[PDB]
mmCIF file of C-alpha atoms (C1' of nucleotides) in Angstrom:
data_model
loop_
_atom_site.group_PDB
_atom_site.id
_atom_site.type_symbol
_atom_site.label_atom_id
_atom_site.label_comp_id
_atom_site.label_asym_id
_atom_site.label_seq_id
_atom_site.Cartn_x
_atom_site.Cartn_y
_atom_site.Cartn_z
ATOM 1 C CA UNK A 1 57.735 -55.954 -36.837
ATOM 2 C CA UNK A 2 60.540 -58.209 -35.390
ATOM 3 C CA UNK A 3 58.951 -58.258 -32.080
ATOM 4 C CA UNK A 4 55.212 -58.863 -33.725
ATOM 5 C CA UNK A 5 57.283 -62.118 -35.576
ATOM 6 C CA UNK A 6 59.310 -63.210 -32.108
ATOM 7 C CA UNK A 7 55.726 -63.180 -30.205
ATOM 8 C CA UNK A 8 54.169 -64.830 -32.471
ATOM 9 C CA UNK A 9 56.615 -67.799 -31.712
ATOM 10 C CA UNK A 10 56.899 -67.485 -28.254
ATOM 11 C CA UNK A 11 60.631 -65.804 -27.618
ATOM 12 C CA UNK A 12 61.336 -63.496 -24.450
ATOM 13 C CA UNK A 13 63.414 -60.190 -25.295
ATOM 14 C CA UNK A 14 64.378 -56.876 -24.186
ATOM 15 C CA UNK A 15 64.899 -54.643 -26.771
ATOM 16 C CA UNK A 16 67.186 -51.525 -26.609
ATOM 17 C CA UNK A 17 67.054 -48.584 -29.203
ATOM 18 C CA UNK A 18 68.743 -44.876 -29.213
ATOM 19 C CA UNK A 19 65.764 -43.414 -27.886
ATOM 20 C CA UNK A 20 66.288 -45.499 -24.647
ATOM 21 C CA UNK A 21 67.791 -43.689 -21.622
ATOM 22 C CA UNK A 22 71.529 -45.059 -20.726
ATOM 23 C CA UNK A 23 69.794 -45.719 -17.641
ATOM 24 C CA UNK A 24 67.662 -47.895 -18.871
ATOM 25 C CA UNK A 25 70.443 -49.458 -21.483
ATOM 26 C CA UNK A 26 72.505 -50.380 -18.322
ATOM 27 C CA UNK A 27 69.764 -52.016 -16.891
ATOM 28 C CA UNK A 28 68.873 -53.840 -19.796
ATOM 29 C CA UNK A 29 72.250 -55.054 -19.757
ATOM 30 C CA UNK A 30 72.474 -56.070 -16.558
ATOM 31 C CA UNK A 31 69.362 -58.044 -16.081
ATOM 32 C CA UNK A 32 69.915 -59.563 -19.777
ATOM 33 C CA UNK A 33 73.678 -60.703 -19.236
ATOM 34 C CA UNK A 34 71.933 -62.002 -15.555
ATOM 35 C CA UNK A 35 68.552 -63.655 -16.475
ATOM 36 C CA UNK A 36 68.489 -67.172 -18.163
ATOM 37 C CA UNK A 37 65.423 -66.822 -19.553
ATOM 38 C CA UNK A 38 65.242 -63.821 -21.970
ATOM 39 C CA UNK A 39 66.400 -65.651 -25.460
ATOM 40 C CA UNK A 40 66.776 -62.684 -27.610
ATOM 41 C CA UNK A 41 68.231 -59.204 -27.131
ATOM 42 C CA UNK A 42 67.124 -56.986 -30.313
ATOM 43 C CA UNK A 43 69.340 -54.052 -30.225
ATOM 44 C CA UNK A 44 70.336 -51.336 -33.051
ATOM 45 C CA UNK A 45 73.499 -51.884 -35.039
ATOM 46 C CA UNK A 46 75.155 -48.303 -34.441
ATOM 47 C CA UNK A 47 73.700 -47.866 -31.042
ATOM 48 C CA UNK A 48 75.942 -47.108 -28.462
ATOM 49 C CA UNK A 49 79.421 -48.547 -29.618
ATOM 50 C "C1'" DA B 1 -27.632 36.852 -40.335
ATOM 51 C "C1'" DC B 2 -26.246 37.750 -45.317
ATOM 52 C "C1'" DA B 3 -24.453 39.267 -49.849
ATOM 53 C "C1'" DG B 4 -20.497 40.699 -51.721
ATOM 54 C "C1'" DG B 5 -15.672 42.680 -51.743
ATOM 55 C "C1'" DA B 6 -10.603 42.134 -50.147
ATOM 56 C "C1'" DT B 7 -7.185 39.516 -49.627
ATOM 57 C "C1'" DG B 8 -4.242 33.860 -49.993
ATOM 58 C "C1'" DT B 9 -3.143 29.703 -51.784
ATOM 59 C "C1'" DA B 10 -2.458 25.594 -53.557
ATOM 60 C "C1'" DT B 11 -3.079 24.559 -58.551
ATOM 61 C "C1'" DA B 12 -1.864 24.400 -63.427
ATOM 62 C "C1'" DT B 13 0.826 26.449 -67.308
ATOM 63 C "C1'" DA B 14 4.731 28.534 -69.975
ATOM 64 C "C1'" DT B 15 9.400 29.480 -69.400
ATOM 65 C "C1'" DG B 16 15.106 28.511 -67.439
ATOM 66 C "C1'" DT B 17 19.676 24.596 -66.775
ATOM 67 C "C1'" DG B 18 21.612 20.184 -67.639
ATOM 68 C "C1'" DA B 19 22.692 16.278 -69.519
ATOM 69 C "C1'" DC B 20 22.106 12.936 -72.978
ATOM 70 C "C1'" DA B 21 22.023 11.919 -77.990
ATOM 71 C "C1'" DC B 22 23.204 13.598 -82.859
ATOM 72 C "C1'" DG B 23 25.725 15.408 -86.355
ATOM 73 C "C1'" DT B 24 30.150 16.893 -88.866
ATOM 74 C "C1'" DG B 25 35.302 16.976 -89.807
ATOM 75 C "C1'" DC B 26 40.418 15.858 -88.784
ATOM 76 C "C1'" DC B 27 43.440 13.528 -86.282
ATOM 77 C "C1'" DT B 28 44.784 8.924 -84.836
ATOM 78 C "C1'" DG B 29 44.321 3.849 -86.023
ATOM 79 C "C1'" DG B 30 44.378 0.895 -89.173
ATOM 80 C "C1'" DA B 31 46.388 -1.316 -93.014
ATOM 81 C "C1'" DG B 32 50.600 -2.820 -95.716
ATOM 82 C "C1'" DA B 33 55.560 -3.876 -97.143
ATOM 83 C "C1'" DC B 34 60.592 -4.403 -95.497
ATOM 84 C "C1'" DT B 35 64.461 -5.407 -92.032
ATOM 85 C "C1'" DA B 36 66.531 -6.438 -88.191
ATOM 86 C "C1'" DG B 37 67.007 -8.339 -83.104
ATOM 87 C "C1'" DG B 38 64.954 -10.324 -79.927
ATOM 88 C "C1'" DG B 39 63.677 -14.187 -78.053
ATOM 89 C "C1'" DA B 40 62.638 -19.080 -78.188
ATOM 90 C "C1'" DG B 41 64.685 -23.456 -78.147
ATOM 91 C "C1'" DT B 42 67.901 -27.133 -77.507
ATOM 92 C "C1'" DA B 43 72.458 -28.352 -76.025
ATOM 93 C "C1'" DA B 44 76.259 -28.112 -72.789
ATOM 94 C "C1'" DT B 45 78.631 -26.992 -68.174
ATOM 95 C "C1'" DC B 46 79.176 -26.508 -62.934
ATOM 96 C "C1'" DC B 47 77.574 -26.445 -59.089
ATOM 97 C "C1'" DC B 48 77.422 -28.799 -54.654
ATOM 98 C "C1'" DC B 49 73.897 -30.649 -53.358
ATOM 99 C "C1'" DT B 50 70.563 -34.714 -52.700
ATOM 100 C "C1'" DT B 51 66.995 -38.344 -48.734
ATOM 101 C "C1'" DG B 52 65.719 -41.942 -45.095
ATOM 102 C "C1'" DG B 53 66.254 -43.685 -41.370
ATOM 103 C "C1'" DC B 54 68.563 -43.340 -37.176
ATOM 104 C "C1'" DG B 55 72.000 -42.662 -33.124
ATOM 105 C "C1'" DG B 56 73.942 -38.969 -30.090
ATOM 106 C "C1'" DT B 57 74.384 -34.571 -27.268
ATOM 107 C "C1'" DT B 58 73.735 -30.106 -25.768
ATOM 108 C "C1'" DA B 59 71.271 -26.125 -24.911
ATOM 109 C "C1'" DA B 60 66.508 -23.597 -26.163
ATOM 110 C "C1'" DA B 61 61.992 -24.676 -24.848
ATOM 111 C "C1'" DA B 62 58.762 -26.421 -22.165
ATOM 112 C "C1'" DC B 63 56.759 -26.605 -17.622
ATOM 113 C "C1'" DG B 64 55.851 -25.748 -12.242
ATOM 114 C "C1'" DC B 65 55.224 -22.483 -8.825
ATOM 115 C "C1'" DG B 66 55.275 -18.988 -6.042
ATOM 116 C "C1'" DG B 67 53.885 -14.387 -5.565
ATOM 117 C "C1'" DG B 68 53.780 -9.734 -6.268
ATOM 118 C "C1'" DG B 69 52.418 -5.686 -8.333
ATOM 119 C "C1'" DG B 70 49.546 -4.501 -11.919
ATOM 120 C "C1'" DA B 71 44.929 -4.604 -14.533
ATOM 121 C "C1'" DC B 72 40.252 -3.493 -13.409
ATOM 122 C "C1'" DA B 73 36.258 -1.807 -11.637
ATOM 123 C "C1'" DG B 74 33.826 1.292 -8.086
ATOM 124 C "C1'" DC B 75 33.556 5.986 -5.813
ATOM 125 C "C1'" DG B 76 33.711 10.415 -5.919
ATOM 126 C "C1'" DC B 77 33.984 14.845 -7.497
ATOM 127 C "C1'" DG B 78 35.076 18.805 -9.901
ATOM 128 C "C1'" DT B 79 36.082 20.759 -13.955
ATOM 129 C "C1'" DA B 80 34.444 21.153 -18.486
ATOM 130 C "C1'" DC B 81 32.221 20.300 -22.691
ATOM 131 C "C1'" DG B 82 27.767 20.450 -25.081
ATOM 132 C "C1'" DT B 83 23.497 22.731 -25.120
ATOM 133 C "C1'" DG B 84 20.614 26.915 -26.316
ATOM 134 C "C1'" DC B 85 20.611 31.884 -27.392
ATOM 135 C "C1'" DG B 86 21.050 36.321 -28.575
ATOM 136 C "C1'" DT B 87 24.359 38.910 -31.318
ATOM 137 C "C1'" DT B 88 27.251 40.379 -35.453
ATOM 138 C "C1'" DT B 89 30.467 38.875 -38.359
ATOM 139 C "C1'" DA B 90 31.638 37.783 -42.768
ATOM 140 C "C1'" DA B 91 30.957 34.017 -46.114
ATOM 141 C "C1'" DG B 92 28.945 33.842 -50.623
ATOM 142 C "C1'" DC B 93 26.039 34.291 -54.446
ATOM 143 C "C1'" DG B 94 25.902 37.510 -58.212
ATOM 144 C "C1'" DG B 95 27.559 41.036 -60.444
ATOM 145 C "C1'" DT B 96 31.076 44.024 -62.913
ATOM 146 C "C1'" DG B 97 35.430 44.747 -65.002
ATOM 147 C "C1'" DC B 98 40.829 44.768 -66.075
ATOM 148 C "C1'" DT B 99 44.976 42.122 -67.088
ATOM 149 C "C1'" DA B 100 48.425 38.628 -66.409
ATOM 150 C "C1'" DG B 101 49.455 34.806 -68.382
ATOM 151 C "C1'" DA B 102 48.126 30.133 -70.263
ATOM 152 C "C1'" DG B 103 47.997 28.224 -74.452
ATOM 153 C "C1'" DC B 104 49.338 28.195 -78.698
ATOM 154 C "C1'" DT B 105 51.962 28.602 -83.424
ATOM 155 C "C1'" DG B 106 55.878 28.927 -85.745
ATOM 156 C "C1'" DT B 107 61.145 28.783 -86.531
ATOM 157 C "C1'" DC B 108 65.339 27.121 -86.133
ATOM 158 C "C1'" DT B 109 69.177 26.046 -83.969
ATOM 159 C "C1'" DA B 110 72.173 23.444 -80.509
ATOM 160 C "C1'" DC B 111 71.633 19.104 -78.846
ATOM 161 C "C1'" DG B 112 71.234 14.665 -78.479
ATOM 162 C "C1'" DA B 113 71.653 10.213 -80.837
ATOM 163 C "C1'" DC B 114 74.165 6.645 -83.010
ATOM 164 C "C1'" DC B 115 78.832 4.885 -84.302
ATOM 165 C "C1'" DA B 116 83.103 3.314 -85.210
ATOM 166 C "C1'" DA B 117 87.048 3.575 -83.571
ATOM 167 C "C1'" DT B 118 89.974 3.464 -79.145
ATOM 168 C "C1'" DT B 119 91.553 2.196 -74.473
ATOM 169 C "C1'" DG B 120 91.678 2.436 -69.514
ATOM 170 C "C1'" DA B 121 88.618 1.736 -65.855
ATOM 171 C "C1'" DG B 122 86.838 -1.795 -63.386
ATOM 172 C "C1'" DC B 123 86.022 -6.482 -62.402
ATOM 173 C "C1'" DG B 124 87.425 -10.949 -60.944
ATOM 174 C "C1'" DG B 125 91.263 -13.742 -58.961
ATOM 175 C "C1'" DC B 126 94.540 -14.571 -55.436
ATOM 176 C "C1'" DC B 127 97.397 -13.295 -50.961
ATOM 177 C "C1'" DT B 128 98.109 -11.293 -46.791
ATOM 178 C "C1'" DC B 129 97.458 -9.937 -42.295
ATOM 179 C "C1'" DG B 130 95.503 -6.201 -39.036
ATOM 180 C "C1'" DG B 131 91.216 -5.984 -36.823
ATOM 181 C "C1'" DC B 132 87.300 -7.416 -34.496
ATOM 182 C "C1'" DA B 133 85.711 -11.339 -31.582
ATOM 183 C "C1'" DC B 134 86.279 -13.908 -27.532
ATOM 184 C "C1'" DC B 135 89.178 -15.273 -22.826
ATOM 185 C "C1'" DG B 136 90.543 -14.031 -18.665
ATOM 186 C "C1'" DG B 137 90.651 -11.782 -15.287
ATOM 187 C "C1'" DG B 138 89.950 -7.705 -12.217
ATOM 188 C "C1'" DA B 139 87.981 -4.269 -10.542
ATOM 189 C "C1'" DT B 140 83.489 -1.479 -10.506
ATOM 190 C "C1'" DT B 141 78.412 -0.874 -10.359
ATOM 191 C "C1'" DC B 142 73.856 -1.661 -9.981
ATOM 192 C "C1'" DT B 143 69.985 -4.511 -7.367
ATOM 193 C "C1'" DC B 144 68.029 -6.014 -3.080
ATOM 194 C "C1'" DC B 145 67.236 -6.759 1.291
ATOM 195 C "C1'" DA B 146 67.904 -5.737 5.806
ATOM 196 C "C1'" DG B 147 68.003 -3.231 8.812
#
DNA sequence: ACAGGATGTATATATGTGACACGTGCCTGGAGACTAGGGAGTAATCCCCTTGGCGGTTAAAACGCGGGGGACAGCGCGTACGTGCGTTTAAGCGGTGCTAGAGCTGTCTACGACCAATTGAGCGGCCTCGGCACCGGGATTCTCCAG
């Protein structure tokens, strides 16, 4: 539902959960911490630590 | 060819089992009045858990694939089991015809059952620590080509 609000506005994100690959949490992190563009990064609270 | 006797044969009638329905009597239910004890019905304690949602990590499943070696059917064929048959063996369907031996009735004890004591198993509560359970090798011993 947080993504259904932030389209509804307009906002770019990537968002990571625990059922994402480290893999694909790396990459995440990488092209987030790289890209400009992507205004929002909606993540879990005790994810990865 | 026929008129009547000399045998059959289903047909109809009076007599043998069985099983239901009835009719007496005698046990077994029913009815009643006491006296627990059992169980219901709260009211307290001690467990040790409780659930949702979610992130993480490791092995048990889950899946792919090859391939082999088994599960099936067909073929054949040779006992072998059912199918008649003629025989004969012995079940059995009624009988007679004793006797053990159930089944009972009565009698009368030893033998349980309470039961109030008495008390020592036995049960829980801790403590301890050998004994299995797992590591770490190191031999051995199967399995599988591969010749």
């Amino acid at each position: 539902v947080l993504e259904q609000f932030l389209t509804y506005h307009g906002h770019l994100y990537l968002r990571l959960d625990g059922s994402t690959r480290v893999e694909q949490r790396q990459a995440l992190m990488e092209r987030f911490n790289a890209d400009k563009r992507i205004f929002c990064f909606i993540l879990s609270t005790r994810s990865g630590g």
